C-alpha cells in the first residue's frame, strides 16, 4: 500500500526467514548508532534521546519497557542479533532504575522508595524486564534484585483482599497487574518456582466487576477504599491486557477478542484500513491517551490476525511520514506518544508465550 | 433547544426524578476522571497538572477544588450507581485541598506557618464543609478526627470575637466565607447530633445590621473590625453566593431579599432570551470585578428553583464559550471567566444545600 | 468649560471640601484601590505586591507609591467624614506594607546595612514617620504609637548630631525633598503629643537657603554631599516643586517668596494659555526630563498654593494623552505618561493643603 | 590553480614543512585561537569556556575540541621553529583547560564515579595522556611529568588486567578510536623516558583484527561490549578514518594494507573528480550521517597517508560551502558544516604525520 | 575653525578648555549623564549597584576598565575648572567605592585564580585601583583611602622586586605592557604625595619592554609575553601601543616621542581627503578597529597626550558622527556607540590634560 515500508507477509515471516526486515534493522540503528543521543548509547542516567523526542517524564518508564519487550522478540528472530538485544536490555534495566524515571513517585508525595509497597505500574515493568534480560543473555547480573522484587510482589498479592496490587494509592488498573503476573511466570521458568499459582484468583477477580463480558471490554479503573468502578470502558486498557493474558491463559483472550473487535474497531476505505475508538458513546477514534489503535496493532500480532494488523498499520504509518537516512529510521510526524516504540514492538512481536519458552544460549 | 446549548433547562431540573445525569454532565465527569495524570481527579497526590493546563492562578485553586466537591455531592444524590464514584472523587478533593500549593499563599503573605490554627476562614471554611460532605456521601471515618479538630477551632473563634464570625486575612471580614463556615457546622451537627449551629442566629442578625443594604437586597463588599469601616460598594457575586448558602440554613432570609437582588443587578436582554449580571451599582457594565457575578447568580437561580433565570443566564454564558464533546469528554474552546467549567458543572447538577444536609445514608 | 479628555472641572476638584464629597472620578480611583480581591493595592496588610507587579513599578519606587497614596487618603478623610473610616483602614494597610522587606530591602542589597531605620536612609524612614502620624490623626488609634515615638526620637537624635541641618539618604547623599518629609513628620508628632521636636525647623530653613538654593531662579540644586562639600551644579524642577509644597505647611511665607520665580524659571504655558508643561532643569527647551516628574509634582504644588489656573493648564497636559476610562465604576489609565502617575494625579485632585492635615480635627465616636 | 572558495593550494599545505612556514590562512587560524582578550580559546589557563559558548559547542564534545587543537599545535611546532614557543604556551593552556570539571564532569553527572582517571573513561584520559606527552616533546618542560607518569601507569595496569586488549570508555563500551589514542600515548611516554609500555601494542593490533574489523571492506564495526560479547553490526567511516590515521604512526604496514579497501567502501568521488564526500556506514547513498564527521576525519587520514588527490577532493567539498572569511588577519567560517569544524580543518592542513611527532627533535 | 558635520564642538575648543578655565557644553552634558538621574546614573552613590552598566550592556570583565577611564577623565576636569573640583572629588570617591565591589573583581575568583584580588598577580585590576587611590587624594586632599593606598603600593613594589622579568602578570603567566604601564604610573602618583622613590623601578621596566616586547622599526609592541615558555605572541597591537605610549609619556616623555611617528606610519590610515582617520589593530590587513575594536579610540587619547591636534580632529570625525549623539534635557547620549567603553574614552580624550600635568596637580 502507499506510504508503507514492507508487506505484512514480510513482518510475519521474520521468525521463519531468521532475519529482521530492513526497516526494523533501520529502527535498531536509530536505537544504537549515534554517540550520546541514541537511547541505548550507555548504562548511565542520561535521557537526551527522550528530551529530543519531547517524552513527558511520567511516560519514560513505559518507553523503556516497550523497547525492552521488542528487543526480547528480536533475540528470538535472529540469533546473530541475540547478543546485541542482550546489551540493549542490560542498558534498559540500568536506565529504568534512575530517579528521573521513578522520581514522580517521591514528588507526588507517595514515598522515597519506589519498590516498597504499591507503584505496580513502575515495579511490574521492572520485574518483567529483569526476567527477559536473564532469558535473553543467561547473565546472573540482576538475579539478587529480581528475587527481592519478585518476593515483594508475591507477599503484597498474598496480603490484599482484592487480587493484585495498586499503582498510586487506591488506584487499581488491570493493565499494570497483567505485567506483574506475567513477570511471575518469567521468574518460575528461570527458577522452577510456583509464584504463578496466584494467576487463577486474579483472572476470576477481573472477570467479576472489572469487565463487561457482552462487549469484551474492561472498565477504566477500580478504587478499593470506596469499592467504585469508573463507569467507562477503555480500548487501550483492553488491547494491552488481552495481549499480556494471551501468554498466561490463551483461552481467556480467545473468548473476548472477537467481541473486543466488534466493540471498538472501525474498518473504512473499503476494508483497506482500520482505526480504534477509545471508549463507547462516541464516533471519535484514538481519544483519551490516544493509544487505542497502536495497542490493538500489538494485540492483532499477539493473536496472529494478519488482516487487522495490515489495516491498522495502513492507518498509523503513512500519515506519520517515515524516512530512512544513513540506514536509520525516523518519523517526521508521529501521531501519538510512544509511537516509534509501539510500531517497533508490533512489527517484531513473537508472542508472549514464545518469550516464556525462549531457548537459552 | 436554544442555539449553542447542550441540553434543555427542563432536562437539568429532571435529573433527580429520572435518577440519571444528562449526557453532557456525564462528559464533564469524564473530563474530571478519564485521562491518566492530567485529569483533576486522577490521584490523591499533590500534582496540579490539570490546573496548570487550565492556567488557574494559585490563589483560586482552593475555590476550584471546593466547587467541584459541592457538585460531586449532588451527583451522589441524583444517581445512586454514581455515589461510590462521587465518594472517590471527594476523597481526592480533600487530599489535594490539604497540599501546601493550595493553602501556601497564607505563609508567603506572612500571616503564619499553619493555615487552620487561627483566621483564614476562606480556606478552612471550605475544608470543613468538604470534610462533612465526604462523610455524608461515603459513611467513611477517614477524616473524622481532623473534622472534629477544625469544627472545634471554628466554634471557639466565633465565641471569642465581639462581632459574629471569623476573619479571612487579619482585619478582613467577608460574608461569603462566613456563610461556608456556618453551613459546615450544620453538616457536623447532622453527623454527630451536636448543636454548633446555635451560633447561626447571632450571625444572621449581625450581617443584617451594617453589612447589608436591605432596600437593594445586596451585601457590602467587606467589613474591617479594627477601624469599624465597611467598604461603601455593593457586590453581586458576594450576594449571589451568600444567599445561595444561607438558603440551606434559613430559607426565609434568602426568599426575603432574592427579588430586590434580581431588581438591583440583573439585566434581561435579547427579547427575554438572555440575562447578564452587573457586579456593583452606578454602572451599566456586566461581570466587572472578579467577573463571576453571572456564574454565581446561575448557582443562586438553581438553589431557589428559578427555571426562567437559569435558562436566560446559561444562554448568555455557554454558547460564546464554544463547548465541544470529543471521545465522550467535554471541553470549552473559550471559557468566559475564572472557575468556568467548575460553576457551570455545579449549577447544572446542584440539588439545593438543604437537600445535601438531609442526604440519606449509604450502608 | 470641560476641556476634551478631562473627567471633571478644576472648579469641581477645589469644591470637594465645601460640598463634603469627592468627585465621581476620585471615587472610581478609590474603587481601583479597594475593590478587586488579591490584585487591588489595599486588599490586605500582607506582604504581596501584585498591584505593583501588574503596573510594572520598579522596586526602588514602591516606597514612593505607598507614601503618595497615603497623603491622598489623609485629605479624603477631611473631605467626606462618611469615608474617614475607609481612609483609616487604607492607611493601616499602607503602613503595614511600607514595613515589608520588598519595599526597604534595596538598602541591604546595595550594602548600606541590615536595618533600614537605625541611621541615614531618610527617603524611606521620613515617609514612614509621616505615615505613622497621619494614620493616628485620621483614626485616633495607638496601634503604631510605640514605633512612631522610636523613629521620631531617631530622627531628632540624628539631626542633633550632624554638622549640616538634616539627615542623608544613602551615605554622603543630601536631598532637600526627603528632608522636607522628615521635618513635616516632626510637626505631626508635636500636634499629637504636645512636644517641640519642630524647633529644629528654623535652622534647616536657614541652611537650605545658603548654598542649596539659587535665589534668583527660586530653584534648589540637585543634591549636596557633605564629605566633599560638593553641590551638583544643576537645578531641579521636581526637587523644587515637592520641597516648596511640603515647606508651605510649616513656613508658608518661605514658599510664597520663591513660587513666582520657580514658575518663571521652569513652567512653559502653550496652546494659547489652555495648557502647561514643566522643564526639569536649566539650559534646555525639553519638558519632564530626568525622572520625568517635573509636571506631576508642579500640579501638586499648584494645588498646595491655591493656583487654579496652573492646576487646570497642567492637568490639560497630563490627563488626556493618558486615555482614562471608567469600567464597572473603577478608574484606569490606558497610557500613563510617567512613573507614580495614578498616585500623583489622585493626590493633586484631593490635596487639602499640608497645613490643613496638621490641624485635622479628631474622629467621631 | 586555486579551486573556487578555497584559501590555498593542496601543494601549498604539503610544502609547509619544507618552506619552514605555515600558510597565511593557518596563521589567521592561530590568530582566532590567540588574539582577542577573554573570548579566544587560548587566552589563559583558567577554567573559562567563553570561546566554546560563542560557538555553541555541546559539553560532551569540549574534550575532543581541546585535544584536536593540541594535535594541530604539535605539527605547527615542527613546521616553523619561530612558532614552537607559541605552540608550547597554547599546549600548556590546552592541558590546564582539559583538567577542568566542565570538560570531564559528564562522567560524574552520568553516575559513573567522582574520579575521571582512576578507571575506564578511556576517551577522556587517553586524550589527556597523549596531550601530556606532546606538551613535553614540544617544550622540554617537566611541569606535568608526575601527572603523566601516574596516568601512563594506570593505563598500563588496566590493559594488563583486562581479558580483551584495551580499556572501555563508559562501562561495557569498547571503541577502537579511543583505544588508538591511549596506545599512541604509550609510544610518546617511551620516547621521552626509554621505557617499553608500547610492548602492549602488538596484542591490541591482533585483537582488533579478529571480530572488530571486516577485512574485505577495510572497515571497523561501530563498538564492542565485553559483558554480552556483542559487536554492533554496522561499520563506521569516522571510526575507521580516525583509527587508521593513529595506527599509521605505530604500525604503518597495518594502515597501508586496509586504506585502499576503506576508500572503495565509503568514499564517493563526484563533479568529474574535482570533489569527494564520505558515507558514514554501508547500505546507503547518503554522506556524513551519524555524528556527521566521516568526511572531516577522512581529510585527516588522507594527510596522514600522503594522498594529495583525496585531500584536495575532500577540502573542495568541505571548505567552500562553509563560506570562510579573513578579517583583521583572523579566520572565521560563516556556515561550519559539522561539529569540530575549525578544529579538524586546522589539524588536517598542518598535520605532519603521527610518526614525525614521535621523532620530534629537542628544542635547541 | 568651521564645525565639521555631526560634531558637537571644534578641536580648538577642546584644547582651549584649560586656558578658558571651563569645560565645553557637551563635556558638561556628559557630567550630567554621569550624575543627574536618581538610581540609574553611574555616579549616583557609593553602593554596589551597577544599573548604569546593565542599561548600557557592559560585559562584567570590562566594568573595571569603565570605572577607571571615567576616573582619569574626572582628574582632568578637576584641573580645568576649579568650580567643578569638589564634584570631580565626590565622583572619584564613588569610583573607588564601586571599584572594590565583588561584581567588578569577582571574575578573578570564578576563573579559579584565588579568593583575594590584590595579594598577587591580577595587575590589570589592582594597577587601576592603585592609580585611582592616588588621583582621588591629589584632587581632594582626603586621607580616606591612604592606609589602603600604602598597603597596595607596597604589594606592587615588593612583587616587582621579586620577579626575574620587570613587572607583574595579569591572570598567571600572562604579561601585558598596557596593565604594567598603569601600575608604574601609580608609583609616580604615590611618590608625588609622600616624597618617596618607588618610581626608581621604572628605568629597568622601560629597558625590559624595549628588548623582545617591541619592534622598534614599526614603533609597535607585540600582543603579550608568557614567562613560563618565554614566548612572545607574534602579532603587533595598535590599542596596546596607543595606551602604553600615552601612559609612558607622563613618566619618560622622550621614550614615547621616539616611537610616536613610526606608530602613526604603521597603523593610522588618513582618508576622505585628510578630513578623517581610522586605525588598523595589527599588521598584514587593511581592516580598521579589529580585535577588541579600540585601536582608533585609544589613538584619540594618545593624540591628545602628544598635543597632535590634526590627528585628534581626524579620528573624532571618524568616531563621533556615526554614533549619532543627542543632547536631551541638557544630558548627552549616543544612539549607536561604535565599540565598548565608547562614552568613557571620548569623555577622557576630550578633557585629558596630559599624565604629566595630573602628576603636578596643585593642591585644593
From Swiss-Prot, chain E:
Keywords: Disulfide bond, Isomerase, Lyase, Periplasm, Signal. The active site is at residue 38. It is found in: Periplasm. Its EC number is 4.2.1.127, 5.4.4.4. Changing residue 38 to A: Dramatic decrease in beta-myrcene hydration, linalool dehydration and geraniol isomerization. Is inhibited by molecular oxygen, high salt concentrations (NaCl, KCl, or MgCl(2)), urea, and Ti(III)citrate. Activity is not affected by EDTA. Changing residue 124 to A: Decreases activity for beta-myrcene hydration, dehydration of linalool and geraniol isomerization. Retains 2% of wild-type activity for the geraniol-myrcene conversion. Disulfide bonds join 48-101, 170-179. GO terms for biological process: monoterpene catabolic process; monoterpenoid metabolic process. GO terms for molecular function: hydro-lyase activity; intramolecular hydroxytransferase activity. Induction: By monoterpenes such as limonene, myrcene and alpha-phellandrene, but not by acetate. (2E)-geraniol binds at residue 170. Changing residue 128 to A: Significant decrease in activity for beta-myrcene hydration, dehydration of linalool and geraniol isomerization. Optimum temperature is 35 degrees Celsius for the linalool dehydratase activity. GO terms for cellular component: periplasmic space. It holds the Pfam family Ldi. InterPro entries: Ldi (IPR041411). Changing residue 48 to S: Loss of activity. It catalyses: (S)-linalool = beta-myrcene + H2O; (2E)-geraniol = (S)-linalool. Pathway: Terpene metabolism; monoterpene degradation. Optimum pH is 9.0 for the linalool dehydratase activity. Homotetramer. Homopentamer. Requires DTT as a reducing agent for full activity in vitro. Anaerobically catalyzes the stereospecific hydration of beta-myrcene to (3S)-linalool and the isomerization of (3S)-linalool to geraniol. Is thus involved in the initial steps of the anaerobic degradation of the monoterpene beta-myrcene. Also catalyzes the reverse reactions, i.e. the isomerization of geraniol to linalool and the dehydration of linalool to myrcene. In this direction, the formation of myrcene from geraniol may be seen as a detoxification process for the monoterpene alcohol. Shows a relatively broad substrate specificity and can use various geraniol and linalool derivatives. This is Linalool dehydratase/isomerase. The lineage of its organism: Bacteria, Pseudomonadati, Pseudomonadota, Betaproteobacteria, Burkholderiales.
